[PDB]
Ligand binder design. Structure first.
Ligand code: FES
Ligand SMILES: [Cl-]
Length: 266
């Protein structure tokens, strides 16, 4: 039989006999491709295979898991129509990194889009999205993050409560939230964010006070590259980033958190 082998890199579509190697037949039709050994023992001729199947049993360089994703074009016979991407030598991954992507898809899943699942997996999902999400925006409602914000932690409010100010004050101010205050799980994907509180603070002459309002969040940019933030990644995440490049992305945090507190200054 013969099969059609479409190559996304060059655009060529070549009929390749099931008893001829893909490289040789593309060359025969005038499409020059990369190679070195031509003997199955290197990655010069490697191509991504996105659809179809080959017999590349003549080659030796790729692992069993790598052969699910890539082909050595010098020693591959097509067994069905195929879609490949030549010149992929610069982009092939080793087993531990192919399986990291697969696992994340299956564990968290359109995939790697929209809402982030609330709870203990959030910083894991966020890191996986950094690695494999290609910069697509994600979201989590402010009420699903697990913020634990109190007035003592909001300097625009405390500035009025700490001075001798009596009356009714309309507060509308941004402030930086170090989400370490909200727990390691949140800090591990949000870090420092900018938030906004809007509300009313009422302070009596005797020091009794009440605050009522809302808190909203501006969008945050997720970027795990260590030079862009405060946190230790740890040895495992450092390792992953020594082998894969991620893509920053925006996290949209919509909604209002209600805040209502009261006290008495002495
Ligand atoms: S050119 Fe070395 S494996 Fe194909
Ligand atoms: Cl004062």
């Amino acid at each position: 039989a013969t099969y059609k082998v479409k190559d996304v890199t060059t655009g060529a579509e070549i009929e390749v006999p099931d008893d001829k190697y893909i490289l040789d037949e593309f060359e025969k039709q005038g499409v020059n491709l990369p190679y070195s050994c031509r003997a199955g023992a290197c990655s010069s001729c490697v191509a991504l295979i996105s659809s179809g199947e080959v017999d590349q049993s003549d080659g030796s360089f790729l692992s069993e898991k790598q052969e699910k994703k890539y082909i050595l074009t010098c020693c591959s016979y097509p067994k069905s129509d195929c879609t490949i991407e030549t010149g992929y030598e610069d982009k092939i991954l080793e087993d531990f990194e192919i399986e990291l992507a697969e696992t994340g898809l299956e564990f968290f899943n359109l995939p790697r889009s929209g809402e982030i699942l609330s709870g203990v997996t959030a910083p894991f999902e966020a890191f996986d999205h950094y690695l494999f999400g290609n910069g697509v925006e994600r979201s989590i409602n402010i009420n699903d993050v697990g913020f634990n914000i109190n007035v003592s932690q909001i300097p625009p409010i405390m500035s009025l409560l700490n001075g001798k100010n009596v009356g009714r004050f309309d507060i509308g101010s941004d402030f930086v939230r170090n989400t370490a205050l909200d727990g390691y799980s949140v800090a591990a994907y949000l870090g420092n964010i900018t938030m906004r509180t809007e509300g009313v603070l009422n302070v009596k002459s005797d020091g009794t006070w009440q605050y009522e309002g809302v808190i909203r969040s501006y969008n945050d940019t997720y970027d795990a590259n260590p030079s862009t933030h405060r946190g230790a990644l740890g040895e495992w995440a450092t390792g992953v980033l020594n082998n894969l490049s991620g893509t920053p992305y925006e996290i949209r945090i919509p909604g209002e958190l209600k805040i209502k507190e009261n006290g008495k200054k002495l």
